[PDB]
Amino acid sequence: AACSDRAHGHICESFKSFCKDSGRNGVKLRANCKKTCGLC
Question: Where in the chain is the site The hydrophobic side chain is located at the binding interface of DPC micelle?
Answer without folding.
Answer: 11, 15, 27, 29
